[PDB]
Structure formats: structure tokens, C-alpha cells
Coordinates of C-alpha atoms in Angstrom, one line a residue:
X2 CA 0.0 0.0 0.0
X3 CA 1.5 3.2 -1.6
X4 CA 0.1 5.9 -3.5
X5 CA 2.5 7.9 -6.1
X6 CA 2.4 11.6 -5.3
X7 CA 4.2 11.7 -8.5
X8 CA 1.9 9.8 -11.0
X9 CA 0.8 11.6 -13.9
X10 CA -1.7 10.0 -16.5
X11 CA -2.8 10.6 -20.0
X12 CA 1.0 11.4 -20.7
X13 CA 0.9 11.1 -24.2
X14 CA 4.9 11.4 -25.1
X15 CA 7.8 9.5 -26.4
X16 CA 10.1 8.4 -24.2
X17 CA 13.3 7.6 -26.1
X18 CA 16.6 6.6 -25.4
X19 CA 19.3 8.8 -26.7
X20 CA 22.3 7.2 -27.7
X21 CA 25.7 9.0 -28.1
X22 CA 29.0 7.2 -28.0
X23 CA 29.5 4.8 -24.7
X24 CA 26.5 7.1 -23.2
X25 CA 22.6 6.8 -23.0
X26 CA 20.4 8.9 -21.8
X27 CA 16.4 8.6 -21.7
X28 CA 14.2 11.4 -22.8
X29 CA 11.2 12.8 -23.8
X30 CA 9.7 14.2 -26.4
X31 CA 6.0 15.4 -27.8
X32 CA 5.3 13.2 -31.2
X33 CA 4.5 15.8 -33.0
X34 CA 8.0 17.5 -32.4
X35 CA 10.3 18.3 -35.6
X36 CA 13.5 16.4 -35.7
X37 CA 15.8 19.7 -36.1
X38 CA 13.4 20.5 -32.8
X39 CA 14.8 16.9 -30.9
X40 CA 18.4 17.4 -32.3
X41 CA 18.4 21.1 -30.7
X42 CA 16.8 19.5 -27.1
X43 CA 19.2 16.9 -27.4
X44 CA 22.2 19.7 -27.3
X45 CA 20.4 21.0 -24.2
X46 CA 20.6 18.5 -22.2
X47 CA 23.2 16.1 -22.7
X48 CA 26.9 17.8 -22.8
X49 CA 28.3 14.8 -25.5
X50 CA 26.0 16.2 -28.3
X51 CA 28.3 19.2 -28.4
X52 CA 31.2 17.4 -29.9
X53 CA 30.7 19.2 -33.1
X54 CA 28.5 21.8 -35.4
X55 CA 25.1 21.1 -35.4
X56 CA 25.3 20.7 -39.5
X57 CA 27.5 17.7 -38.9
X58 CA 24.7 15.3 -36.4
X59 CA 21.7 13.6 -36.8
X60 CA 19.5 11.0 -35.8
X61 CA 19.6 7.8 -36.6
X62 CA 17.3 4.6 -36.0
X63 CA 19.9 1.4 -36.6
X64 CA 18.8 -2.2 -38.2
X65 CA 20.5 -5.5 -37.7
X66 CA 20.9 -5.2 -41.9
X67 CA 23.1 -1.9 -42.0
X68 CA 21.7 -1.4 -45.9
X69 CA 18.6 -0.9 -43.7
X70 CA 19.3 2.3 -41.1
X71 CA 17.9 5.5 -41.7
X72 CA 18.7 9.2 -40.5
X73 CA 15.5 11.3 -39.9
X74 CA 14.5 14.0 -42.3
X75 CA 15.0 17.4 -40.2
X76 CA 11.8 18.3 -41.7
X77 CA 9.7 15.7 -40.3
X78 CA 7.9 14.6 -36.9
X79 CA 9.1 11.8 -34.4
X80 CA 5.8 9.9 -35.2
X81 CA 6.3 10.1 -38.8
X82 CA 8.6 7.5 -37.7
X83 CA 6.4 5.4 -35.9
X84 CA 8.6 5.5 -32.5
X85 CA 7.1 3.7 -29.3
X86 CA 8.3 4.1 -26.1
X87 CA 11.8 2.6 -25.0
X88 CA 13.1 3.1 -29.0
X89 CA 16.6 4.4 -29.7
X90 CA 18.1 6.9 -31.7
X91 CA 21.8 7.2 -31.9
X92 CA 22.8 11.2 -32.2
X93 CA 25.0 10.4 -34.5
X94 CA 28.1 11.5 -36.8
X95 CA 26.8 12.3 -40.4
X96 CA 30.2 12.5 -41.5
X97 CA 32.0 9.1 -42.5
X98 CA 35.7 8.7 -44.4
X99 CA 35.5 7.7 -48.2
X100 CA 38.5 6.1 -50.1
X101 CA 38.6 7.0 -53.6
X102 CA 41.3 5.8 -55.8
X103 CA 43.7 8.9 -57.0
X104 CA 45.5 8.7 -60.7
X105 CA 48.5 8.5 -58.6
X106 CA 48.4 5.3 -56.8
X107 CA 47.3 6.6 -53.6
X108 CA 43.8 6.7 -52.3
X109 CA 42.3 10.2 -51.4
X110 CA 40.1 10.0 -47.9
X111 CA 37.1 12.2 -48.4
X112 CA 34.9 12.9 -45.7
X113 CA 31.0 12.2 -47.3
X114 CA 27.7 12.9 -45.8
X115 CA 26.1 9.3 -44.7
X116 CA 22.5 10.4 -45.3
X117 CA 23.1 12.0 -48.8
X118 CA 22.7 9.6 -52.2
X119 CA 25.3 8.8 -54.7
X120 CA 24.5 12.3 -56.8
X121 CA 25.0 14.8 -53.7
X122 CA 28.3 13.0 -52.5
X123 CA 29.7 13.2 -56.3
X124 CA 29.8 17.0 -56.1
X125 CA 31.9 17.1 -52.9
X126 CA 34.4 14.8 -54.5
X127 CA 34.9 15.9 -57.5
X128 CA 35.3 19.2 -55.7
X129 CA 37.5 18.4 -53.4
X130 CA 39.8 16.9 -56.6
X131 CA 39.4 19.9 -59.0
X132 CA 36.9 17.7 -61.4
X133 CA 34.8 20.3 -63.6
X134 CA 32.6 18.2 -65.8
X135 CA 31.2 16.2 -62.6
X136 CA 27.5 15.1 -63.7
X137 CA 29.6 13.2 -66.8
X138 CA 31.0 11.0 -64.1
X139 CA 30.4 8.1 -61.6
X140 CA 31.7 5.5 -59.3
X141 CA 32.5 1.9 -59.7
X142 CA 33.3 -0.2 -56.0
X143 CA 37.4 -1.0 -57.1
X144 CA 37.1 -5.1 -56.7
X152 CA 31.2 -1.7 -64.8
X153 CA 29.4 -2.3 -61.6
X154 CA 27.8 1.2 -61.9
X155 CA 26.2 2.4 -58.3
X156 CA 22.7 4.1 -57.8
X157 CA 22.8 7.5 -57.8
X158 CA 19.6 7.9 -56.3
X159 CA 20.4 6.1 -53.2
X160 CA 23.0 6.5 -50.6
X161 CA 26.2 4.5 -50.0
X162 CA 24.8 2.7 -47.4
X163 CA 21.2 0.9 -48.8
X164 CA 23.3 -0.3 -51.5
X165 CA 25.5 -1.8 -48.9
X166 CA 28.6 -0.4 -49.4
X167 CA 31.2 -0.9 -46.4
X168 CA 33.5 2.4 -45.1
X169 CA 36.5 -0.2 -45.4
X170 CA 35.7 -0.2 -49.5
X171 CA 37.8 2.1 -51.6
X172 CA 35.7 3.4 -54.7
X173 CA 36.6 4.4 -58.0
X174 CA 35.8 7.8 -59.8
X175 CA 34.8 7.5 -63.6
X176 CA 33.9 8.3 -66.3
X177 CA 30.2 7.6 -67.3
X178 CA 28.5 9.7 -69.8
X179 CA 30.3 10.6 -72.9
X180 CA 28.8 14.7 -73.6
X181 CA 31.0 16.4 -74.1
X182 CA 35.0 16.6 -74.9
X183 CA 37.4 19.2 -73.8
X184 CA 40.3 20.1 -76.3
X185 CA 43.1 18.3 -76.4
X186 CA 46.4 20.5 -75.1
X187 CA 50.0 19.6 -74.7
X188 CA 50.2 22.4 -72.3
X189 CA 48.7 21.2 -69.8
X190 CA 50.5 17.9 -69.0
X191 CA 48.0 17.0 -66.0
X192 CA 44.9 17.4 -68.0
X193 CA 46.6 15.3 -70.6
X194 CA 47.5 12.4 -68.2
X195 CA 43.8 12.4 -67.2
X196 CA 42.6 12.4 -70.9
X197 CA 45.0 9.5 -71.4
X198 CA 44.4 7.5 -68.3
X199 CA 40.6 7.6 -69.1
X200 CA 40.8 6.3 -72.2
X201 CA 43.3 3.5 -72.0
X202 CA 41.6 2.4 -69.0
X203 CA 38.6 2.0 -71.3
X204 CA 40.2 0.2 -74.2
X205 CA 42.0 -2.1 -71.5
X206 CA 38.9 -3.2 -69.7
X207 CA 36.9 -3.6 -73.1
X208 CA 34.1 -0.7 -72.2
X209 CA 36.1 0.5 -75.4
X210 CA 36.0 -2.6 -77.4
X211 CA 38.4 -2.4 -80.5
X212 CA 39.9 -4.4 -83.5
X213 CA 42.9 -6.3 -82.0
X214 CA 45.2 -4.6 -84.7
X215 CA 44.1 -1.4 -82.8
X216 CA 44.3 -2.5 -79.6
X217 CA 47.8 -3.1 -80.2
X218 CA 48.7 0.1 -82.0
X219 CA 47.4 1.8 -78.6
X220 CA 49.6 -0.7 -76.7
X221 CA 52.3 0.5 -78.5
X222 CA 51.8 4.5 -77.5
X223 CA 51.6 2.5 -73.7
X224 CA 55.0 1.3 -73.9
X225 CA 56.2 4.4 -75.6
X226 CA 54.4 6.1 -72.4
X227 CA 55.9 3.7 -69.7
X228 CA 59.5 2.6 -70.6
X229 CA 60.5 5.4 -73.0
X230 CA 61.6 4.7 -76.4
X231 CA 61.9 0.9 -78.1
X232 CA 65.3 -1.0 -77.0
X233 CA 65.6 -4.0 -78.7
X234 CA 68.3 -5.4 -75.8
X235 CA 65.6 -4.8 -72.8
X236 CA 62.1 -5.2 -75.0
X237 CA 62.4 -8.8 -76.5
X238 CA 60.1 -11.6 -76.6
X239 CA 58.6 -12.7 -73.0
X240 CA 59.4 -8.9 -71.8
X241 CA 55.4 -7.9 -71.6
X242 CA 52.5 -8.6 -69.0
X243 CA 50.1 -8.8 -72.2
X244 CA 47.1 -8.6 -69.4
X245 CA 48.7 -5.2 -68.8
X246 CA 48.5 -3.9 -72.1
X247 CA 46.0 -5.5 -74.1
X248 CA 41.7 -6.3 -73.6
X249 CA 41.4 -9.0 -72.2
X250 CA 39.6 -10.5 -76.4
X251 CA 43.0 -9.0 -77.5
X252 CA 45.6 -11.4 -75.4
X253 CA 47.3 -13.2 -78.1
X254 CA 50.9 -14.4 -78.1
X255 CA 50.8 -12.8 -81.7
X256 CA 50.6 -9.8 -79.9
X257 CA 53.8 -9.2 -78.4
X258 CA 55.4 -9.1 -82.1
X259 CA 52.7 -6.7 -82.8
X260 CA 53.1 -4.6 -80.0
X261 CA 56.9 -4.2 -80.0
X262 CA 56.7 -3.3 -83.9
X263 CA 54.2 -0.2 -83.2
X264 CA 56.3 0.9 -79.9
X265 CA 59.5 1.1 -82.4
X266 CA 57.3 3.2 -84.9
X267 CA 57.2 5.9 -82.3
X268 CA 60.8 6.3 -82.2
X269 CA 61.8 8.5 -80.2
X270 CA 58.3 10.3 -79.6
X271 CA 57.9 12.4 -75.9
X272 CA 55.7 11.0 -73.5
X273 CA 53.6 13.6 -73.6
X274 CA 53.2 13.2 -77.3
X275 CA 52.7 10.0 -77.1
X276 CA 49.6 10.7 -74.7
X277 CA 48.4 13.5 -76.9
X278 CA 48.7 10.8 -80.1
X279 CA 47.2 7.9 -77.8
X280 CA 43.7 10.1 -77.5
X281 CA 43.1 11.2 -80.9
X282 CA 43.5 7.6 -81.6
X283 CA 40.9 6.7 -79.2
X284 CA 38.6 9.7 -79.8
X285 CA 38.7 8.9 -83.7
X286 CA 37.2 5.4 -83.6
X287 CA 33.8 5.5 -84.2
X288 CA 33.0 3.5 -80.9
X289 CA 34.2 6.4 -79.0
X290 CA 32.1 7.6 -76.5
X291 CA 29.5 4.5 -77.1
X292 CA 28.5 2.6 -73.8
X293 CA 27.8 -0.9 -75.3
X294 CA 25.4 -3.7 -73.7
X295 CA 25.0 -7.3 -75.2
X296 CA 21.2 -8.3 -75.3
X297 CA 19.4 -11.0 -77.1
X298 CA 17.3 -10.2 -80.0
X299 CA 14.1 -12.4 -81.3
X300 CA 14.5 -12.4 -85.1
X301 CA 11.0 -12.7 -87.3
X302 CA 11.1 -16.8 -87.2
X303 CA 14.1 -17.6 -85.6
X304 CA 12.7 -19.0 -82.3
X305 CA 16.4 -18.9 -80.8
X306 CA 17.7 -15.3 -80.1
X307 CA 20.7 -14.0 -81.7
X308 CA 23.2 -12.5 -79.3
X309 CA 23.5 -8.3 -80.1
X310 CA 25.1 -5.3 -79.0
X311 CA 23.0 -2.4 -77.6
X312 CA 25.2 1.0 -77.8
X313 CA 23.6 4.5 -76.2
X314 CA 25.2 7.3 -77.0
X315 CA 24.4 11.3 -76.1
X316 CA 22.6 11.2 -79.3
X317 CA 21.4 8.1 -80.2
X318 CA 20.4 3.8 -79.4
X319 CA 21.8 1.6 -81.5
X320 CA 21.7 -1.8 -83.2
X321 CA 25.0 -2.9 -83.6
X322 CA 26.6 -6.4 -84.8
X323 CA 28.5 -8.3 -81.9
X324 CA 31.3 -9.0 -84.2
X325 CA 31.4 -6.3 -87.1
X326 CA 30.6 -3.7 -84.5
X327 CA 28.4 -2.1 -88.3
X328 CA 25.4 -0.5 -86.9
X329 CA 22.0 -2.0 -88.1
X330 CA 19.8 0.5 -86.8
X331 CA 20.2 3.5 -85.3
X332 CA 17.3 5.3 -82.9
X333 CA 17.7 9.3 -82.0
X334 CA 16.8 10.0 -78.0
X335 CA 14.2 12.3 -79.3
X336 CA 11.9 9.3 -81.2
X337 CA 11.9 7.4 -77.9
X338 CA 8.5 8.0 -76.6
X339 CA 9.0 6.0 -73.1
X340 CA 11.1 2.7 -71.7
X341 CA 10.9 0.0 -69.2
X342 CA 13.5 -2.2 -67.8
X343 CA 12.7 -5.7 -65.9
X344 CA 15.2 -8.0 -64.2
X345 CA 15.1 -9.6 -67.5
X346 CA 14.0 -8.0 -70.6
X347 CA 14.1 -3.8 -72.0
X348 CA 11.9 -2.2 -73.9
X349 CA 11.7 1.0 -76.2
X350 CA 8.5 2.8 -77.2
X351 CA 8.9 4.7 -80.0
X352 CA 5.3 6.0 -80.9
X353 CA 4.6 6.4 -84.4
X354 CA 8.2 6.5 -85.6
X355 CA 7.8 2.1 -85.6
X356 CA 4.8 0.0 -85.7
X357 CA 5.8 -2.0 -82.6
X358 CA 8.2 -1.9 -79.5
X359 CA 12.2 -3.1 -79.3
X360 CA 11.9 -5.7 -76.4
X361 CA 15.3 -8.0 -75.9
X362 CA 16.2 -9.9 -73.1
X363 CA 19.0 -9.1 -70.8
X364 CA 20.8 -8.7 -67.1
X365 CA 21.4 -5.3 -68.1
X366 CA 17.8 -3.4 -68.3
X367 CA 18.5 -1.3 -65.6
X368 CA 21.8 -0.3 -66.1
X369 CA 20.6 0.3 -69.8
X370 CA 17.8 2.6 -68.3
X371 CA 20.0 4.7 -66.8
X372 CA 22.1 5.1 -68.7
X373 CA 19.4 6.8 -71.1
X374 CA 17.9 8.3 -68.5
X375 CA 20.9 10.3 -67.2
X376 CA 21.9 11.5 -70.7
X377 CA 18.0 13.0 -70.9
X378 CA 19.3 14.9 -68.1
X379 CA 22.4 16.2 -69.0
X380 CA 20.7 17.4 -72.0
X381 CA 17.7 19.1 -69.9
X382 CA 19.7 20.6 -67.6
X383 CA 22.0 21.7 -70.8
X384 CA 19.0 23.1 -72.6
X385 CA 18.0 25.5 -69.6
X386 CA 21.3 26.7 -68.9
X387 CA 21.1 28.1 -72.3
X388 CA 18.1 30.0 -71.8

């Protein structure tokens, strides 16, 4: 027998637990209270929330599945969230470190906002490297896995331990060539032969070992026949991996004497117009699997988007069949399986192929449509 002087009924509030670091406190809060509203209490009242700017917290509701956690809009309400009583929210560090592989060898740390997608955190680091032309470009984890730029690093589930890479995506537009600035240049150059060597450039293996040759020219200065004889090249080094031919070598060696005794830097400057003067430049290619008129099995075919244009394009003779302009596709649809073009009136009937690749294909579209809408407003 006790009575509670204290008791109070038809208290109608949350009572959290905040949780900072090694501490936790409990405390209260009206549902209907704005988030920006609990950080601010939460700097009144517990002296560990102080640690930092304001700009750099938030609150954060944890899941057994990481990909799964979510930080609080400051715009909302608490019951938005649909909190009960005895729930935790960590006040937590928005901030995390982000390892981005540099041209140099080393990886640059950048610090990245946890509750901001793929597109927000590309501006900080192309900022924070001097990158101009940043909606052209994208990140791949190091292991053409292509992340979602409308969703944040962690619902895709990628770790802080992971070091990214920062490339190229979209192909809109091309800066000038120029000797005179050698870093530009060694970009220029380190983008493209990156391309031709992983085969998103695909190219004729007499090519691919004409660029080879500007890459030894590059790397070991000019030709010696005592030092560059047979068995001397890592072919996986310097050729696609469709190019790696024993044949090679002969091949490779001949075009690295043909540059004589060519600078490094014109060797770079000759290695891009080479690249930039194929007509698979700036193509992002996909293999899908057409259904011919009879034919009941599919025939294997290359799907290339380009800032202008989809195209139908032969897996071998890299010819193009068909060619579609962005501007006569009236909508698209990707499944886990199969895409598919509408193109209105321009055809009588869709282009539906089967393929892993529909969503990647998507946005691929998709995001050139931007560039070119934000483009067109610019210029208004």
C-alpha cells in the first residue's frame, strides 16, 4: 500500500533513449515535435551532443541489416517514424571517411555525408579533386558495376572499409586536347586506355595493339631492342582481355618502335586522338538478345547509347543495323530480365530483348535525358 504523489496519467509522449557514443540517456519528447526540434533538445541536455556543429549530427534509428538504417528528415515529426516508447536513436556522426582511388596510386580519404545519395556526395568529391565536368562522371566499388545515384552509399551496402573508383560515365562532351597542360593530358590519357584495357572501349585487335604501343612508348621510353624482346610484356597489362594473343607481343613491340623516339607527352596527346577517332568512341555498349521474325532462338546483339542516339550494332562487325535518336523514344521499361523502347509512331511495334542489363541500360538513357535538360535551360 502506496500511492505515487508523483503519478501523472494521460501522458501522451515518447520516451526515447538517446544514444551518443558509450553514453545513453532517456528522454522525452511530444510526437509531433520536428526532428531539427529533438536534435536542438538533445544539445540541451546532454553535454556529449556538443562534440561538433550542429550541420554535422543527426538522428539515426539502426537495423541488424546496415543497408537498412535510416537518418530522420529534419523536416519531419518523431511519429512520422512510428517510435514507441523505449526506442533508440543514436545522435550520431553524419560524417564518414570515403576512399577514392587517386590517378597517382594513392587513395584520397574524403569525408561524405552518410544520409546523402550517390549524386549529392559526387559534387563534394569531384570538388575536393578539382573535377569540372562532374554530372559526366560516376563511381564503380574497385574489386562496370555502376552504383545508384539515387540512393546513398549505405542501402546499397557499401562498407567504409571499401575504396571506390571515380569514372567516367556519360560521354557529352569533350574538352580540347592540349600539350600544355601535361595533367589534363594524363587524365585524358588515363581515361581512355583504361577504357580500351577493360573492353568498355571494345576495339579491333590490330588497334588495340597500336594503342599498346603509344603505352610502352608512355611507360618505358623509347623501343630497346636489348631490354624489349620476346617474354618482356605482362600482355594482361596492355591489351583487352579479347586482344591477349601471343601474336601480340610481335605486334606490339613493332608499333612501340614506330614511335621512335616520340615524348611522353606526345605519345599521350597521339594515344587520344587515336581513341577519340574510332567510331566506338564515346558508345556505352550492352550485349542483349534479340528475337529475329522466325528464328525462335535469339541471336546474341550489342545495344550502344550514346548522347545522341540507341543503337543496333553487330556483336562482331561492331556495323550499326539501326540507329534510334533520343528524341523518337517515346518511353522505356527495364525488368530484371528484358528492355523495352517505345517509340510511338516512328515504328509500328516496341524493341523488347532480353537481358541482365535493363537497368543499367535505363540509366544510362535516363541520365543522358538529363544532362541534355539541364543543358537546354542553362542556355536560356
Amino acid at each position: 500500500n502506496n500511492d505515487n504523489p508523483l503519478f501523472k496519467s494521460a501522458m501522451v509522449a515518447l520516451s526515447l533513449k538517446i544514444s551518443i557514443g558509450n553514453v545513453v540517456k532517456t528522454m522525452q519528447f511530444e510526437p509531433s515535435t520536428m526532428v531539427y526540434d529533438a536534435c536542438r533538445m538533445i544539445r540541451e541536455r546532454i553535454p556529449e551532443a556538443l562534440a561538433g556543429p550542429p550541420n554535422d549530427f543527426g538522428l539515426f534509428l539502426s537495423d541488424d541489416d546496415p543497408k537498412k538504417g535510416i537518418w530522420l528528415e529534419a523536416g519531419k515529426a518523431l511519429d512520422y517514424y512510428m517510435l514507441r516508447n523505449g526506442d533508440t536513436m543514436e545522435y550520431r556522426k553524419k560524417q564518414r571517411p570515403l576512399k577514392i582511388r587517386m590517378l597517382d596510386g594513392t587513395v584520397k580519404t574524403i569525408m561524405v555525408d552518410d544520409s546523402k545519395t550517390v549524386t549529392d556526395m559526387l559534387m563534394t568529391i569531384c570538388a575536393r579533386i578539382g573535377i569540372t565536368n562532374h554530372d559526366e562522371y560516376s563511381l564503380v566499388r574497385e574489386l562496370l558495376n555502376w552504383l545508384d545515384h539515387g540512393r546513398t552509399l549505405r542501402e546499397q551496402g557499401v562498407e567504409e572499409h571499401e575504396t571506390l573508383l571515380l569514372r567516367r560515365k556519360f560521354f557529352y562532351s569533350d574538352q580540347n586536347v592540349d600539350s600544355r597542360d601535361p595533367v589534363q593530358l594524363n587524365l585524358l590519357y588515363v581515361q581512355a586506355r583504361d577504357d580500351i584495357l577493360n573492353g568498355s572501349h571494345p576495339v579491333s585487335f590490330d588497334k588495340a595493339c597500336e594503342f599498346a604501343g603509344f603505352q610502352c612508348q608512355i611507360q618505358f621510353g623509347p623501343h630497346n631492342e636489348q631490354k624489349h624482346k620476346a617474354g618482356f610484356l605482362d600482355l594482361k597489362d596492355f591489351l583487352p582481355k579479347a586482344a591477349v594473343k601471343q601474336k601480340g607481343e610481335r605486334k606490339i613491340f613493332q608499333a612501340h618502335k614506330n614511335c621512335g623516339q616520340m615524348s611522353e607527352i606526345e605519345a599521350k596527346v597521339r594515344y587520344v586522338k587515336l581513341a577519340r577517332s574510332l567510331q566506338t568512341y564515346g558508345v556505352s555498349f550492352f550485349l542483349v538478345k534479340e528475337k529475329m521474325k522466325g528464328k525462335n532462338k535469339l541471336v546474341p546483339r550489342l545495344l550502344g547509347i550514346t548522347k545522341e542516339c540507341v543503337m543496333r550494332v553487330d556483336e562482331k562487325t561492331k556495323e550499326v543495323i539501326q540507329e534510334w535518336s533520343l528524341t523518337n523514344i517515346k518511353r522505356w521499361a527495364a525488368s530484371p530480365k528484358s528492355f523495352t523502347l517505345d517509340f510511338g509512331d516512328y515504328q509500328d511495334g516496341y524493341y523488347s530483348v532480353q537481358t541482365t542489363e535493363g537497368e543499367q541500360i535505363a540509366q544510362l538513357i535516363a541520365g543522358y535525358i538529363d544532362i541534355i535538360l539541364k543543358k537546354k535551360k542553362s542556355k536560356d
